[PDB]
Design a protein around this ligand. Structure first.
Ligand SMILES: Nc1ncnc2c1ncn2[C@@H]1O[C@H](COP(=O)(O)OP(=O)(O)OP(=O)(O)O)[C@@H](O)[C@H]1O
Ligand SMILES: N[C@H](CO)CCC(=O)O
Ligand SMILES: [Mg+2]
Ligand SMILES: [Mg+2]
Length: 468
RNA sequence: GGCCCCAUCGUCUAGCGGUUAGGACGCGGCCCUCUCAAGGCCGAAACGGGGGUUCGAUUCCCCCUGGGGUCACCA
């Protein structure tokens, strides 16, 4: 069948590049009723960030993806954390030695740097070490690494399913280290070994790994194993077209969640990075994407991640995809974080409905509608101005208000339209100053609904401090 | 620089020899309207250059240019 995987390295915040690549592996596996695996690639203790693993795993779930095998879901080919598979790579690196496909190299990092300077890149000098001598030096405990012994001279063919075949000259492929002197494997060794043993048949990964594939094809040959299909996804870019990075763009999935972006929208946006629906539709579900996916509709240019379009899309989801109640629920954590509370679900729902078309992120809701949940709201200079200018006619409306029994949006509008008429003045001239009295702002939803919302007593109580 | 990949509006893109080169974000205008939004409508905006192949290139081939990626005891 079809087995795909995402192999995140726990060395920093959950990366948007990770979600993007994971998204396509998940779809390609589901499209073929296959398996989507999660393998944690923690082979470098130096860059290892404790707690990054749980974070990436939670972020993939948050985004909506589900995996069939992995660290916290089990599976027949675990462990799914490379740090727990060390004896394995060890066993295979040694197998390469016996097959004459690898060799031990004892140079210190300092000599290597010197060799890199003198000849630019390791020159494979350790190949001239007699195997028996290498062995003895290893048995004595002499620190060393195991390197890939590239067949020189020669040529190596790599086949990308989206680009075609690429023929490499073996002189462009280095005798890369497979096993480090601390006993850990390098990405090259572990990736091929683990993909084989886990049964992956479809490697979908970012284009940044394209040139490293020949190294992988050689390893698969060395082991006498069948290579999987390779599909390299174009890299996500910063506005300047360079591979998206932490300083030129927001790459942290935690930032997006913190900013109030809906996972559903972020996911939908990610789908448009390199792919497009047959009919041209832009808003669609994860499940629809899975079902319409095809490599034929994947474009290879490096897509610039447009934060602006994402906000737009996020707003689009909030008002057209999620239900009112779903939006009301998602907005709570942000209200809590803002230190605000709501009277009841009923109140909250109504508040969210009024503001629905006016915020593009969940975080903006407590900011633009703060006056709806606390008296501790700011008053803009322009609002304070409109209020002062309208104080006279507001004083004359107050009594009519406290006299109004039917406190409804229909009645209220009728009461005000009349007041503006009987006063020979445009509605806005009365509406705007009142709006500033109730909201401390001149940018809000409709006055009647805003007026109704709080109820007669509450409204007048606020209108009073403004006239006081 | 060597090697590799890529190339349609500013950005994400549709196109798979013949189209007024379409959509989306953003931008500008109009309508709606009690503000601000949302929404509707209109508009400005692209095939990097040069050769070919061909009756006919955005589309197929080649060169170059440009952009990106990679060349670690990191992934
Ligand atoms: N900027 C990016 N754009 C697109 N895909 C990316 C990007 N960065 C990583 N990926 C891909 O997403 C997956 C995430 O792998 P990983 O968690 O190790 O992220 P990473 O950025 O490569 O981390 P590291 O710093 O250790 O190299 C891989 O399949 C990788 O190819
Ligand atoms: N550990 C690597 C994370 O980038 C795996 C990349 C891949 O081969 O798909
Ligand atoms: Mg473009
Ligand atoms: Mg046009």
């Amino acid at each position: 069948m079809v087995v795909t995987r995402i192999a995140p390295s726990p060395t920093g915040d959950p990366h948007v590049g990770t979600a993007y690549i994971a998204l396509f592996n998940y779809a390609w596996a589901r499209r073929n009723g296959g398996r989507f695996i999660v393998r944690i690639e923690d082979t470098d203790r130096a860059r290892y960030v404790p707690g990054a693993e749980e974070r990436i795993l939670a972020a993939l779930k948050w985004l909506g993806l589900s995996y069939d095998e992995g660290p916290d879901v089990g599976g027949p080919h675990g462990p799914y954390r490379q740090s727990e598979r060390l004896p394995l790579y060890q066993k295979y690196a040694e197998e390469l030695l016996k097959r004459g496909w690898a060799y031990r190299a004892f140079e210190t990092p300092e000599e290597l740097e010197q060799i890199r300077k003198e000849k630019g890149g390791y020159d494979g000098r350790a190949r001239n070490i007699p195997p028996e001598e290498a062995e003895e030096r290893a048995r004595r405990g002499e620190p060393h690494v195991i390197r890939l012994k590239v067949p020189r001279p020669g040529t190596t063919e790599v086949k990308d399913e989206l680009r075609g075949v690429v023929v490499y000259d073996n002189q462009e492929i280095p005798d890369v280290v497979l096993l480090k002197s601390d006993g850990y494997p390098t990405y090259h060794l572990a990736n091929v070994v683990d993909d084989h043993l886990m049964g992956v048949t479809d490697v979908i990964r970012a284009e940044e790994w394209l040139v490293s594939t020949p190294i992988h094809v050689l390893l698969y040959r060395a082991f006498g194993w069948e290579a999987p299909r390779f599909y390299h996804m174009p890299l996500l870019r910063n506005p300047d077209k360079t591979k998206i990075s932490k300083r030129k763009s927001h790459t942290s999935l935690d930032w997006y969640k913190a900013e109030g972006f809906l996972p559903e929208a972020l996911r939908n946006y990610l789908c448009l990075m390199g792919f497009s629906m047959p009919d041209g539709r832009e808003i669609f579900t994860l499940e629809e994407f899975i079902q319409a996916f095809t490599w034929e509709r994947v474009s290879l240019g490096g897509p610039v991640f447009d934060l602006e379009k994402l906000r737009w899309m996020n707003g689009k989801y909030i008002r057209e995809v999620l239900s009112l109640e779903e939006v009301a629920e998602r907005v709570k954590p942000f209200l809590r974080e803002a230190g605000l509370s709501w009277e009841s679900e009923a109140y909250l729902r109504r508040a969210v409905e009024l503001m629905r078309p006016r915020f593009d992120t969940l975080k903006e809701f407590p900011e633009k509608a703060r006056y709806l949940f606390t008296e501790d709201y700011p008053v803009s200079e322009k609002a304070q101005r409109k209020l002062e200018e309208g104080l006279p006619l507001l004083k004359e409306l107050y009594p009519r208000l406290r006299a109004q029994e039917e406190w409804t949006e229909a009645a209220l509008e009728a009461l005000l339209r009349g007041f503006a008429a009987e006063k020979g003045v445009k509605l806005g001239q009365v509406a705007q100053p009142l709006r500033a009295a109730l909201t401390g702002s001149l940018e809000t939803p409709g006055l009647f609904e805003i007026l109704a919302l709080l109820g007669k007593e509450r409204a007048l109580r606020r209108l009073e401090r403004a006239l006081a």
